[PDB]
Amino acid sequence: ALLSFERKYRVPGGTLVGGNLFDFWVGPFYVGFFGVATFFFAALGIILIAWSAVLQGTWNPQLISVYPPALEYGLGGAPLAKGGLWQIITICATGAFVSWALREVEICRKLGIGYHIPFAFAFAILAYLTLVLFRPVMMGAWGYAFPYGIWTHLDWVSNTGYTYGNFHYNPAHMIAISFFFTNALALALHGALVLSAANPEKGKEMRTPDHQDTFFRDLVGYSIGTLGIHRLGLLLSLSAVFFSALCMIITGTIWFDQWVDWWQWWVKLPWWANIPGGING
Amino acid sequence: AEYQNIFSQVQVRGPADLGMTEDVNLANRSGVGPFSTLLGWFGDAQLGPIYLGSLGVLSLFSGLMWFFTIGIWFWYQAGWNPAVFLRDLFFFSLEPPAPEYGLSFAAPLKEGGLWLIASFFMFVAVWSWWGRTYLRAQALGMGKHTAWAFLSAIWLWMVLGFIRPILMGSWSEAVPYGIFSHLDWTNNFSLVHGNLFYNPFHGLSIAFLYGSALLFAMHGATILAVSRFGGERELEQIADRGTAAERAALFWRWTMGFNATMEGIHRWAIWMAVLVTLTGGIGILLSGTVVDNWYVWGQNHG
Amino acid sequence: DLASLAIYSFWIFLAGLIYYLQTENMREGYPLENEDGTPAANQGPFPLPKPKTFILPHGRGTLTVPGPESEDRPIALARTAVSEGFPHAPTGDPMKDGVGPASWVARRDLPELDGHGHNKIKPMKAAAGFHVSAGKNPIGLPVRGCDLEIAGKVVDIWVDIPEQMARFLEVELKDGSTRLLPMQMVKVQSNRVHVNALSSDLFAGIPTIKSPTEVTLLEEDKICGYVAGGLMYAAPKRKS
Numbered sequence: 071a072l073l074s075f076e077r078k079y080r081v082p083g084g085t086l087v088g089g090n091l092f093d094f095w096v097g098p099f100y101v102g103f104f105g106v107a108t109f110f111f112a113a114l115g116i117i118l119i120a121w122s123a124v125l126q127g128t129w130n131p132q133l134i135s136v137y138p139p140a141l142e143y144g145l146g147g148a149p150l151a152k153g154g155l156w157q158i159i160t161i162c163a164t165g166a167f168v169s170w171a172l173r174e175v176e177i178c179r180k181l182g183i184g185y186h187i188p189f190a191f192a193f194a195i196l197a198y199l200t201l202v203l204f205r206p207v208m209m210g211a212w213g214y215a216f217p218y219g220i221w222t223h224l225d226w227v228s229n230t231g232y233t234y235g236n237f238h239y240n241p242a243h244m245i246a247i248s249f250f251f252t253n254a255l256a257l258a259l260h261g262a263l264v265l266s267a268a269n270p271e272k273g274k275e276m277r278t279p280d281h282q283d284t285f286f287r288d289l290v291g292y293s294i295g296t297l298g299i300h301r302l303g304l305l306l307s308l309s310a311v312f313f314s315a316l317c318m319i320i321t322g323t324i325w326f327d328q329w330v331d332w333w334q335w336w337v338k339l340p341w342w343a344n345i346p347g348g349i350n351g
Numbered sequence: 352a353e354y355q356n357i358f359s360q361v362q363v364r365g366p367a368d369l370g371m372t373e374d375v376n377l378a379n380r381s382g383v384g385p386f387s388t389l390l391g392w393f394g395d396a397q398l399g400p401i402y403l404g405s406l407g408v409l410s411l412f413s414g415l416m417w418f419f420t421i422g423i424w425f426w427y428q429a430g431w432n433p434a435v436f437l438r439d440l441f442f443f444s445l446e447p448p449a450p451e452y453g454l455s456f457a458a459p460l461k462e463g464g465l466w467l468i469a470s471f472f473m474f475v476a477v478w479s480w481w482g483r484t485y486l487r488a489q490a491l492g493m494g495k496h497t498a499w500a501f502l503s504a505i506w507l508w509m510v511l512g513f514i515r516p517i518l519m520g521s522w523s524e525a526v527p528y529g530i531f532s533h534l535d536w537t538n539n540f541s542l543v544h545g546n547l548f549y550n551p552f553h554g555l556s557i558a559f560l561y562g563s564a565l566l567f568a569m570h571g572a573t574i575l576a577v578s579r580f581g582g583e584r585e586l587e588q589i590a591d592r593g594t595a596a597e598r599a600a601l602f603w604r605w606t607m608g609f610n611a612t613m614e615g616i617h618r619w620a621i622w623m624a625v626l627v628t629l630t631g632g633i634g635i636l637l638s639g640t641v642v643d644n645w646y647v648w649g650q651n652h653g
Numbered sequence: 654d655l656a657s658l659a660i661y662s663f664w665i666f667l668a669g670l671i672y673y674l675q676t677e678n679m680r681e682g683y684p685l686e687n688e689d690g691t692p693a694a695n696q697g698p699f700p701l702p703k704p705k706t707f708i709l710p711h712g713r714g715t716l717t718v719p720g721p722e723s724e725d726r727p728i729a730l731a732r733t734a735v736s737e738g739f740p741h742a743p744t745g746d747p748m749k750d751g752v753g754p755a756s757w758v759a760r761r762d763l764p765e766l767d768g769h770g771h772n773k774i775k776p777m778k779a780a781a782g783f784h785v786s787a788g789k790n791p792i793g794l795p796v797r798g799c800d801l802e803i804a805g806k807v808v809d810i811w812v813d814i815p816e817q818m819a820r821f822l823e824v825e826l827k828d829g830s831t832r833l834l835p836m837q838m839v840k841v842q843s844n845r846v847h848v849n850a851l852s853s854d855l856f857a858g859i860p861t862i863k864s865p866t867e868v869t870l871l872e873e874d875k876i877c878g879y880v881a882g883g884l885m886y887a888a889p890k891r892k893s
């Protein structure tokens with residue numbers, strides 16, 4: 071049940087809501103008021119999802135799919151079988167997510183650490199809210215949201231993309247991808263660096279950090295350092311997801327045409343717009 | 352508000368650190384560089400020194416040759432006009448030889464030869480730099496994690512412009528050097544193989560990419576959350592568990608039911624990132640050599 | 654076919670890999686225990702990994718994990734219920750006792766050494782050639798606690814030589830003694846240094862270091878521990 075050093079940490083307090091009421095654990099897990107909140111939202115949501123599955127007449131997970139209301143319903147409510155169920159399920163997800171974040175906050179307090187983790191998570195939550203709330207509202211129907219199904223959701227991605235041409239040309243999409251790639255690069259390195267120091271060549275002593283900084287200056291002439299790489303990681307990650315939201319929130323709202331075409335602005339600057347030759351002249 | 356430790360609130364500087372010596376040929380290391388107070392707000396403020404050596408120079412020279420060989424081609428396309436060059440910079444493209452020449456090294460220069468030169472340059476550039484990551488580690492007596500991690504990346508690149516073009520029978524199947532052109536090639540590569548979303552490696556690869564962000568978000572915010580206990584000094588924490596390591600592990604145990612150790616978390620890390628291009632490489636390799644259309648394959652499984 | 658082969662293969666690879674990953678993270682704090690310290694009955698599907706031994710630099714010995722676990726300090730906590738899973742209430746002063754968000758681990762009572770075998774962290778006064786290169790130099794600024802009362806003055810900065818980082822602020826209290834304050838728990842302002850976790854009256858309780866030019870892993874933990882705990886336990890004294 072407890073890690074060899076856990077007991078002295080399991081003291082009362084830190085709860086945001088409800089005092090000592092839910093201030094307790096279940097196996098390794100911490101409950102807290104929000105422990106309960108998330109459970110309830112999670113229970114409800116899964117139920118509704120199964121209920122959608124009978125109306126659909128399949129129990130096969132590769133097939134199950136809960137779709138939003140069709141565009142004709144705009145931002146109004148829709149019949150269960152006709153889009154209501156997704157709308158509730160979406161409400162329930164949100165409930166789950168936010169609650170899961172606030173529990174993280176409550177654990178943070180009991181342990182006496184910073185709130186960076188709940189913090190970073192809120193970016194994930196905000197990306198999800200962008201795709202099922204902010205964008206549809208702004209566009210004008212729940213129908214612009216993505217459906218909850220394993221492959222159907224990949225389909226929405228593909229269809230929504232190809233609507234504006236090759237989505238690769240969405241400029242904030244370019245930026246968002248550069249982080250995803252960069253972050254992975256940096257996670258690759260960080261991990262590798264620490265391990266190689268902690269697990270040197272056979273029979274040698276644990277290298278030191280002073281080795282970590284040296285290994286990299288030797289390699290690329292600079293070492294962001296230990297506190298750095300952790301600040302770096304948090305940032306690349308949060309940024310990747312920040313730009314991911316951005317590229318979507320603008321798509322279909324302030325730009326509805328082909329993304330490639332938006333680049334004509336550059337190429338049509340009057341100082342070289344008419345100069346012959348090249349690719350565009 | 353409380354301090355967050357995303358940016359330093361006081362900078363401190365001493366004599367330029369010339370680093371650990373070990374088996375390193377000190378003759379090759381450079382001279383310390385200026386210090387950047389700009390950078391000093393994030394990570395380290397000190398620039399340099401850097402280790403040159405034979406492999407560094409070869410790598411660094413081939414590296415520039417590659418880049419320049421592409422550059423002259425762009426200029427030739429731009430009508431040597433600096434205005435066009437700027438206007439059309441992302442439209443220019445150095446394309447592989449036509450399918451006609453196959454795996455031939457005899458394609459005319461304007462028709463694909465120049466692409467081979469550039470690639471040859473990149474090949475040597477990249478491999479030498481790989482050997483560089485390895486040696487730099489050896490000379491400090493360190494594990495070779497970094498070189499092996501690097502090898503994963505190399506895998507996907509090897510497969511894209513070398514192994515797959517060769518197994519298909521022609522260089523024309525490789526990726527063109529160009530900003531918009533390599534985007535198009537990608538988009539088109541999926542169309543031709545029946546939508547890469549049905550390539551289960553592609554799907555796996557995305558999971559590990561998404562995951563890398565998830566994890567580096569988790570790890571980073573955690574270490575910052577406990578840097579108030581010298582959390583960020585991970586080797587010593589490994590060698591002698593501090594409350595930092597404890598609060599870290601527990602926050603996570605109490606949230607989701609299990610947890611890492613300080614050495615442990617970094618194994619999760621190196622593997623989550625390395626699996627991105629590992630799986631990736633495989634998904635692409637089978638694409639068009641063994642499987643012509645992932646949707647059809649998806650219907651049968653064979 | 655081949656593809657089918659490859660993917661089935663991979664899902665198998667991946668499964669033994671997780672298994673590996675998982676057992677490696679079982680190197681500390683395992684095996685599990687009951688609230689009374691007796692070994693717990695259900696330790697999960699995963700076995701303990703086979704031990705690994707780390708050779709610590711500067712002849713500081715070896716470390717073998719997993720290995721015999723022991724807190725090596727008293728815990729002043731008492732159960733608040735008759736069944737498992739409820740909090741344990743401090744039986745004294747959690748701060749003074751070092752439980753809760755004020756917990757510290759019995760790390761070695763030796764300082765962290767740099768790559769050369771010299772003390773990693775030093776008061777700047779004794780760090781030849783170090784200076785505040787940017788930002789507000791705290792040194793000389795009064796220190797304010799969450800109760801908005803002055804508690805002391807910064808009389809030095811303890812820097813991390815190998816990373817050129819400010820780790821702690823050394824503070825001179827009203828009685829002329831000094832304490833270390835983690836850099837990460839104070840806001841350096843233009844005319845003062847503000848500490849939100851501790852009220853002026855608790856600065857004296859901050860554990861002291863035995864030698865004036867060195868800190869040990871044990872003392873770092875006892876200090877960081879203490880200051881962090883203020884956040885929850887000084888709470889009645891904190892106003893804003």
Ligand code: BCL
Nearest residue numbers: 198216220221223224227553554555557558559561562565
């Ligand atoms: C954000 C970008 C796009 C999108 C584009 C894609 C693309 C492109 C792909 C996926 C893939 C996946 N997507 Mg998606 N996906 C989106 C939004 C979502 C949402 C959401 C609520 O917002 C979720 C939960 C998922 C979940 C998933 C997984 C089924 C799968 C692997 C992801 C992964 O490894 O992440 C990293 C996270 C982890 C490793 C942590 C653990 C995650 C586990 C696997 C979560 C599974 C949840 C799932 C089974 C449903 C549970 C819900 C109920 C409680 C039952 N996507 C939006 C619309 N998604 C890949 C796939 O192969 O699936 C077809 C794929 O190729």
Ligand code: BCL
Nearest residue numbers: 504508537538540541547548553556557560631632634635
């Ligand atoms: C229309 C587009 C198609 C498609 C077609 C492809 C194709 C084609 C490929 C990918 C690939 C990938 N796709 Mg896909 N993909 C689509 C939609 C998506 C979506 C989505 C819809 O949300 C996502 C999230 C992804 C995500 C991804 C990545 C997981 C994956 C590449 C990983 C990587 O980091 O390589 C980045 C890393 C590298 C390329 C390694 C290179 C390392 C070298 C050595 C670097 C050298 C630098 C050089 C020498 C210059 C030096 C630098 C200078 C000094 C500055 N795809 C659709 C279906 N996708 C790749 C893959 O693996 O697929 C299975 C791939 O080949």
Ligand SMILES: CC[C@H]1c2cc3[nH]c4c(c3C)C(=O)[C@H](C(=O)OC)c4c3nc(cc4[nH]c(cc(n2)[C@@H]1C)c(C(C)=O)c4C)[C@@H](C)[C@@H]3CCC(=O)OC/C=C(\C)CCC[C@@H](C)CCC[C@H](C)CCCC(C)C
Nearest residue numbers: 251254255258410411414476477480500501503504624625
């Ligand atoms: C495991 C997967 C991820 C990964 C890992 C990875 N990559 C790696 C490593 C590892 C573990 C290394 O050790 C190695 C490295 O040394 O990094 C520091 C590398 C590396 N990955 C790199 C790039 C890279 N990795 C990528 C991807 C990934 N790498 C994956 C996501 C990508 C993409 C496309 O996503 C890129 C672009 C290099 C930084 C470095 C390998 C360097 C190399 O091989 O150099 C060879 C040649 C040269 C010396 C060329 C120099 C020519 C330049 C001077 C021209 C450009 C001039 C330009 C205009 C300059 C200005 C830039 C401004 C920003 C200031």
Ligand SMILES: CC[C@H]1c2cc3[nH]c4c(c3C)C(=O)[C@H](C(=O)OC)c4c3nc(cc4[nH]c(cc(n2)[C@@H]1C)c(C(C)=O)c4C)[C@@H](C)[C@@H]3CCC(=O)OC/C=C(\C)CCC[C@H](C)CCC[C@H](C)CCCC(C)C
Nearest residue numbers: 115163166170190191193194218219220311561564565568
């Ligand atoms: C912001 C950067 C990245 C990030 C960070 C991040 N994620 C995080 C955190 C952080 C910092 C956490 O602390 C938290 C965590 O605890 O991790 C272990 C979390 C987490 N990120 C998760 C998943 C996740 N994160 C993702 C993405 C990312 N997370 C980013 C790329 C993704 C994808 C698709 O990329 C996924 C799948 C969880 C493992 C975990 C949060 C767990 C959680 O919220 O539990 C509460 C909810 C439930 C128990 C289930 C609720 C059931 C619903 C009511 C119904 C189901 C509806 C759903 C909409 C159906 C979708 C079906 C699909 C097929 C489309």
Ligand SMILES: COC(C)(C)C(=O)C/C=C(\C)CC/C=C(\C)CC/C=C(\C)CCCC/C(C)=C/CC[C@H](C)CC/C=C(\C)CCC=C(C)C
Nearest residue numbers: 419421422470471474508509511512513526528529530533
């Ligand atoms: C300012 O102007 C001057 C001229 C000074 C410049 O220098 C400007 C230069 C620029 C304009 C340069 C611009 C360069 C880019 C736009 C480059 C973009 C490159 C990419 C987007 C590349 C993407 C993908 C590349 C891939 C996957 C390459 C793979 C290569 C290989 C695996 C190598 C394979 C080897 C070959 C085929 C030959 C092997 C032969 C043997 C004998 C072994």
Ligand SMILES: CCCCCCCCCCCC[N+](C)(C)[O-]
Nearest residue numbers: 145146147157158160161164203
């Ligand atoms: C966090 C809330 C998320 C809700 C997601 C969608 C709910 C749609 C609410 C509309 C209900 C009725 N209406 C049209 C009268 O407003």
Ligand SMILES: CCCCCCCCCCCC[N+](C)(C)[O-]
Nearest residue numbers: 551552554555558562622623671
């Ligand atoms: C590092 C361990 C975590 C790995 C995450 C494994 C779950 C990913 C599930 C992806 C679903 C994939 N597939 C093959 C059907 O496309």
Ligand SMILES: CCCCCCCCCCCC[N+](C)(C)[O-]
Nearest residue numbers: 096097098099607608609695697
């Ligand atoms: C993917 C999530 C995995 C989480 C693993 C959690 C381990 C819990 C150990 C069993 C505890 C049991 N319980 C709840 C019945 O008391």
Ligand SMILES: CCCCCCCCCCCC[N+](C)(C)[O-]
Nearest residue numbers: 608609610671675696697698699
């Ligand atoms: C895709 C990520 C999945 C994470 C893998 C799940 C590992 C669960 C380990 C549970 C450990 C149980 N224990 C011993 C803590 O009780």
Ligand SMILES: [Fe+3]
Nearest residue numbers: 264570574585
């Ligand atoms: Fe780390």
